[PDB]
Every structure is written in structure tokens, then in C-alpha cells.
Amino acid sequence: QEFQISDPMRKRVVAYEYWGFWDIEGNGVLEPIVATWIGSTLIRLEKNPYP
Amino acid sequence: KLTSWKNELSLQALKADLDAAKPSHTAMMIKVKEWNDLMRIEGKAKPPKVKGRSQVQPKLVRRQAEWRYSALTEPFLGSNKLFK
Amino acid sequence: KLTSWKNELSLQALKADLDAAKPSHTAMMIKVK
Amino acid sequence: QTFFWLKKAIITARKEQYFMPLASVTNMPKHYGKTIKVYEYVPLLDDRNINDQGIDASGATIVNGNLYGSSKDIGNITSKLPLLTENGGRVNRVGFTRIAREGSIHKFGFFYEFTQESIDFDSDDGLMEHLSRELMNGATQITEAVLQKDLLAAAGTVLYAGAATSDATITGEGSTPSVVSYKNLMRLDQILTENRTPTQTTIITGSRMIDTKVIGATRVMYVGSELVPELKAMKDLFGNKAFIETQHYADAGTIMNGEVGSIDKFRIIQVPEMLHWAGAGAQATGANPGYRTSMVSGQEHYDVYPMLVVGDDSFTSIGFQTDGKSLKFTVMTKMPGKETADRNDPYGETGFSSIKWYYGILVKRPERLALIKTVAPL
Amino acid sequence: PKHYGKTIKVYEYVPLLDDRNINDQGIDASGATIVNGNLYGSSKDIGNIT
Amino acid sequence: MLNYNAPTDGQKSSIDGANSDQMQTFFWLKKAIITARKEQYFMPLASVTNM
Amino acid sequence: MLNYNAPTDGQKSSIDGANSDQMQTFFWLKKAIITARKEQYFMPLASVTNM
Amino acid sequence: FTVMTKMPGKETADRNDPYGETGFSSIKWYYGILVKRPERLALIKTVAPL
Amino acid sequence: GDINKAMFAIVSFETCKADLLKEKDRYHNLNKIDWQSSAPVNEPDHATTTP
């Protein structure tokens, strides 16, 4: 519970990820997306990369 | 705004979905914890402590799973190649 | 300064990592004993 | 003692909350105390620009640095114009001022206890899920109530109806009852327009369907469920009906959630949980025409109802590790058992579940919060 | 189903904040015991809630 | 028990000595609000003649 | 004459009004001052014995 | 030196403190000496200048 | 739970000055360490079978 590395570039911070379908264009067609956020910051948001 | 899509999801919608899905997951995990408790002899499994009597409990579930582990792991490790 | 790196680790960081990691090892070694 | 249980419990839903989504979130980094401050730069000509840095055209020192305050008088302007001569030098000087505001954070929480006998011997399965759901619903309702109370207390523009001038002077009985009138809505609109408050909506022009009316309201008003019967029967200045229901302009317009109609330049929204001061009004005698009262220390007193309007960028929600939403809850459950029983309870047969959060609000400019206090009918 | 008499029953859960929730498990902020368990009932007073 | 108390209101956190106090107590956004220019109506009407 | 004056010691700056004060009045290094461990001379001599 | 520490959180929540805002760090060790040849230890007692 | 994802690993061993002198270039700053007087092997944390 208490372990912390000295160097901040090696600190471990919990992150969340979301895999799901969304209607990106509002047209009624659902498409897969991926989104990653830490805390209250949305750091990445894009379509599904895997073929 | 990260991208150029017409409809942007935003964090609030995603967190609404998470907070909707969470109650079922929390109710589910209690059963998993109970099964692990039966396996490892903790929680409800552990016998009560009495000063003048024993508190031993032989491990049945652990034993039954102990042969199954080695029975199942072997076919995946029989050859140098894994995929055909 | 031993080497020419722009950022050097220094001994304080190393002992900090050692003292941070040691408590878990202490709790584990009891089981092996 | 043999009964057949339907195994489908009767459960209600959670209160819909309208004030919380309006808020905007400002982050507080940790290790900075628990207070936020900002600056406001007052313009040159406003009244608040008080400074001892003024020289008029004649060259003398004068008390007021700003050339002329927020005064529309022609004579005053003609008196205080900055004039210059051919051989000008050291003629006119001005100065500026900045103002600071702050907000802070508080802390809340509550918990409950259960026993393992309760969760085991009970006939109804899924008791735990029910208890957790009820707890979370209660927490959200409490949060929204706190936010609404703070907004009502921090209001800047207040318009008492009728002839009263305080909560105590609000009354229904008498020659001049204190109820909403069309002139009051017009006056509130005029004040808000003067305050440069940006308009939330846009004018709805006509449609092609038969029996369709046009509405030119540009703002949003929040009322309780108690005022709506009073509002439905208002008459405008000339005498005809004032309220315009939603079915008339459902086409050619977008009906927002909870909207009941539109009067003058306001689209009325009905909030289920709207708070009212109880007994704040004057004493109620036997001449009550049918307005709500409340029992205050053995005396009947009238009731006061908020009728709130919220402008744009009036406030933000201070967020301390509050994540995306304006509030973040922290909940932990300790399942009862002997394993937990080590120090306090030798047996440890009771568990618990606690929820806590940090709440804080900052009002940047309180001149865009408007509020009309009135009594409401039975 | 048979062999259950001629009676059927259900359970109705009441939320935390309604006044029907008459229980005896309250502790106030100071730490003392209080008469009502539910924080505040259906009441919508500013003063009572605050 | 080490506590925080209130750095303001004339109280001290227990970590702080007799000679010290907290360096930072508030947070500053560095974004100050601005009042927009009053809009003009009579100016567009006027026509210009050279002198 | 917009003067900085001396914000600390109670002499408010000229620009500030009757409600506000200078937001920052000092710079903080964030690199504290510490002392090292005392050297040990008798500890190296001793020897350890399990029991 | 056997060092134990419990940061505030779920693990330090208990019936006395249902929410849990506390903590502690502790350090302990064992000690004892056995003297095999005390004749070899030497000492001189004297006063010292100011 | 994976050795590959580990950031660091620290190992303590017994060595003599001849081992360090076998490759002079690798090691610097050997004069400060004493090699004349201290002759117990008593470092507590290090566990060894040496008498």
C-alpha cells in the first residue's frame, strides 16, 4: 500500500480504459471506440486499432 | 475536444455507464471471494478458536483442485511448438 | 560525479529504493524461515 | 406460516436532479490548502474604481480618479469631460483597481451497520444490493439539496413581490398580497438584460401546423411544483391568458427536460425537490384566502418560495480529487466475521459501509443570480 | 403454486429519506444518539435541512 | 494525532515548529475575469467629411 | 503613480483596492535542509549470534 | 529493524473509526550481549579539562 | 507478479579487494574504503554461512 519509487517518471498510477460501441456521427450507426482517462483527464480517444 | 467527430462522448457519459454497471459487479465479486475463502480456509471457513479444544480443518476443495491443475496444464506443454 | 550522463542517480536514491522495498521482503522471509 | 413470496421487491427510483449538471468543475491541486482565489479587473469608468490618483483639466488634484462613474446624466458628463488645450501637459490622469474573491471546501459522510445473521437467515435474497442502492440514492439527493441551498443563499438580484421588503414582511392577507405578477417578470427581465446576462435560448418562430403559437422567451426559470397552479392562471396586462403550454410549440422547437410552458421571456422548468423557507412570512390570521402556512413556535406564518433564475458563468464547482463529475464518492465495505475481529470486537459480527465526499463552490460574479420570493397557493 | 395456502406476499423497500422510515438507529454529528434515524424526512425547509 | 488543525484562524499544524508556518494556503487560478466593451450604436450612422 | 510599495508590512500596493492583496510575496526553493546520520564506531566491532 | 506502516484507507477502517483517517509507522529490534573474556576489556576513569 | 516488469533488483554479496582489482577500469574510488582494521563480518541484513 505504501511503496513509492523516488523518481516520478517511474511512479505507478492507476489508469482506466473503455472499450465499447458508440455512434460517433449521430447517424444511427454504431462503431467501436477506445478511450483512456486518468483521474479527471482524458488522455486518449480514438477508434479501434485492431483489425 | 480531442477529435473531430460530430458527437463527442465526454468523460461524464462513460462514468455514468461505469456507475450503472458497478452494482452488479460488486454483488458478483462476493461469490468469488467466498469460493476463494473455502479454498484457502479463511473467513467463514476457518474454525472457531476454543481454549481447550482443536481447530484443525482438512482441506478438501484444495485437494480436489490440486489434481485438476496438473491434469489440465500438461497438454499445453507437451511439445516445443504450441500452435498448429 | 562518476559518469558523464546528464542525469545521475546518486547514492541517496538507491538507498531510498532499498529502504522502501525492504519492509515487504522482511514480511516474506518469515514464511520461508 | 406458509406464504408464497413473489420474489420481486417493490422499489422506487431516484430523484431527478437539475441543479448539479449546470455546474462547471474547477480543479484544486493537492498540497495547496483548501481555498481558491482569483482577480477581477474593474473597468475604468465604473463606480468601484476608487483611487486617489486624479487630476482634472485645471491641473488640481481631485478625489475621484475615474473620469465619471456609471452615470447617464448629461449634465454630469458635460461637467466631467476630459478636455485638452493646445499647450497641454499634466492634464488628465486615471487609475485602475482589481478585486479578489474566494471559495472553500467542506467535508461530509455517513455510514450504517449490519449483522451476518441478517444477511443469512433472511428470506429475501439480494438484501445487500438493496441497501447499497438506497444509500447511494440518499447521498446523491443530499448533495443536490446542498448545492441548491447554497445557490439560493448566494443570490445577488432579489425581487420581493407585492409591497414587502423582507422575508418577514411577505404576506398573503391584506390589500396587497405578495404573489407573482406580470410586471414582476418584466422587471426581472429588464434587470437581467441590464446586467448583460447572456441569453440561454433563442426565439421560436412559427410552424405550419394549425393552432400553433409563437414564443419569444430567451431565458430559463426554475419553479417548484407548488407555484405552478398559481402561474397557470396569470393574466397579462391587457387581460388575456399569459401561460403558453408546450403542446403549442412542441413543433418548431426543442422541449427541454421538465419544461411546463413559457411566460413573457422565461421558459418555466419544474423542479421536483425545490426548497422553500418555512414560516419566513408574516403571521397568518383568520383572514387567510387559501395560501400555505406553517407552524412556528405556536404561531402560523406564511411560506416563501424561491423561483430561481441562474445566469451563465455565475459559479464553478471546486473539485478536490473529484474526478470528472462535480463530486466523487468514496465507499468501503467491511464484511462481518471473526477475521476482522482483532482489536475492538472480540467477535466481529457487525459490518459497515461508509460514503464520504468533498464539496465546495466558488461564485465568480453574483450579479447574474436572480430570485423572486412569493407565497404559493394551497 | 400448490401447498402454499391461499396467500401471496411481496416486500416493499422504502428509501432512506422518507418519513415512513421510522427506525431507531440514529447517531448525530456530535456522537450522541438521536430519536430519528433518517437524516431529514420529506421536509424541504432550508433551516431544518441545514 | 499529528493533525492539520487550521493554518489560518490563528492555529498551527503540529508538524510546524514555533518559528515556521505553511508556505501555501490558497490556490490562484491566474485567470482573471474581463468585462467586455460596451457596444456602439450611434457611431456607424455618422458620415465623414474631410477638412 | 502606480507604486509597488511594500505589500508585506501592511502598505498595500497602489493598484490593489480595499478588497485584494498581492497574491504572491515570496519564492520557495522546495529543496529543504537536512542533516546526515551519525557515524558509528562500536557497531562494526560487534558480532552476531543466532539463538 | 522490522518496520510496519499502515497508510489511511480501507485497511485502517474499523468499528471505532468507520471511515478511516489515521495511520502509524513503527520500528523495532532485538538486542543482547554476551561477554566471553571480560579480562580483555580495559577502562580508565578520569576527569577532563573544561 | 512478473519478473520482466520489475524495475530494479538489489543483491548483496561478499567480495575481497583482489576481486575489485581484477578489472581496474570498471571500479573507481577504492581508497576511501578501509581494508586494514575492520575485521568482523557482522553486517546484520546480509545472511551468510560464514563463521
Short mmCIF file of C-alpha atoms in Angstrom, two decimals, chain B:
data_model
loop_
_atom_site.label_atom_id
_atom_site.label_comp_id
_atom_site.label_asym_id
_atom_site.label_seq_id
_atom_site.Cartn_x
_atom_site.Cartn_y
_atom_site.Cartn_z
CA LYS B 1 -12.05 18.37 -27.70
CA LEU B 2 -9.66 15.59 -28.69
CA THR B 3 -11.08 14.54 -32.07
CA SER B 4 -13.14 15.81 -35.00
CA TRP B 5 -16.17 13.52 -34.58
CA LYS B 6 -19.59 15.16 -34.72
CA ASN B 7 -20.63 13.52 -31.43
CA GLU B 8 -18.09 13.65 -28.60
CA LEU B 9 -18.55 11.19 -25.77
CA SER B 10 -17.00 13.22 -22.89
CA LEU B 11 -15.98 11.67 -19.56
CA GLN B 12 -19.35 12.10 -17.83
CA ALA B 13 -21.19 9.67 -20.11
CA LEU B 14 -18.52 6.99 -19.71
CA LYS B 15 -18.57 7.39 -15.94
CA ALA B 16 -22.36 7.17 -15.97
CA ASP B 17 -22.04 3.82 -17.73
CA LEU B 18 -19.45 2.68 -15.18
CA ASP B 19 -21.60 3.71 -12.22
CA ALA B 20 -24.57 1.93 -13.78
CA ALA B 21 -22.64 -1.30 -14.31
CA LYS B 22 -20.82 -1.30 -10.95
CA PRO B 23 -23.60 -2.57 -8.58
CA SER B 24 -23.90 -5.88 -10.44
CA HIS B 25 -20.12 -6.38 -10.46
CA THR B 26 -19.88 -5.71 -6.73
CA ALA B 27 -22.60 -8.27 -5.99
CA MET B 28 -20.81 -10.74 -8.26
CA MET B 29 -17.38 -10.47 -6.62
CA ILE B 30 -18.68 -11.57 -3.21
CA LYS B 31 -19.27 -15.09 -4.53
CA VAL B 32 -15.75 -15.25 -5.96
CA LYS B 33 -14.32 -14.16 -2.62
CA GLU B 34 -16.40 -16.81 -0.83
CA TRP B 35 -15.16 -19.56 -3.15
CA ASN B 36 -11.56 -18.48 -2.59
CA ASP B 37 -12.25 -18.46 1.16
CA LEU B 38 -13.46 -22.06 1.03
CA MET B 39 -10.35 -23.00 -0.93
CA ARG B 40 -7.80 -21.26 1.31
CA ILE B 41 -9.53 -21.73 4.71
CA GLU B 42 -10.30 -18.16 5.80
CA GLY B 43 -13.40 -16.14 6.59
CA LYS B 44 -16.38 -18.39 7.23
CA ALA B 45 -14.23 -21.46 6.58
CA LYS B 46 -11.83 -21.01 9.50
CA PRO B 47 -12.90 -22.99 12.60
CA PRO B 48 -13.69 -21.16 15.84
CA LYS B 49 -10.98 -20.78 18.47
CA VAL B 50 -11.63 -22.60 21.75
CA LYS B 51 -9.08 -22.77 24.56
CA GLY B 52 -9.40 -26.44 25.41
CA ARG B 53 -10.16 -27.97 22.00
CA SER B 54 -8.76 -28.28 18.50
CA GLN B 55 -9.11 -26.04 15.44
CA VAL B 56 -7.88 -28.29 12.61
CA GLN B 57 -9.73 -28.42 9.29
CA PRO B 58 -8.52 -30.72 6.49
CA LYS B 59 -8.59 -29.16 3.04
CA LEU B 60 -10.98 -30.88 0.66
CA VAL B 61 -11.54 -28.29 -2.08
CA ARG B 62 -7.81 -27.61 -2.27
CA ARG B 63 -7.07 -31.31 -2.79
CA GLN B 64 -9.74 -31.81 -5.45
CA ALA B 65 -8.40 -28.80 -7.33
CA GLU B 66 -4.81 -29.95 -6.78
CA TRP B 67 -5.16 -32.92 -9.07
CA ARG B 68 -7.19 -30.94 -11.63
CA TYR B 69 -4.47 -28.30 -12.06
CA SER B 70 -1.76 -30.74 -13.11
CA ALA B 71 -4.24 -32.81 -15.11
CA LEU B 72 -5.16 -29.80 -17.25
CA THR B 73 -1.85 -27.94 -17.58
CA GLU B 74 0.05 -30.80 -19.21
CA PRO B 75 -1.36 -30.99 -22.79
CA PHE B 76 -0.36 -27.35 -23.42
CA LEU B 77 3.26 -28.16 -22.53
CA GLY B 78 3.87 -31.48 -24.30
CA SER B 79 5.80 -30.19 -27.31
CA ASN B 80 8.25 -27.47 -28.29
CA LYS B 81 5.64 -25.78 -30.51
CA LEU B 82 2.31 -24.54 -29.15
CA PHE B 83 0.15 -23.56 -32.13
CA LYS B 84 -0.84 -25.62 -35.17
#
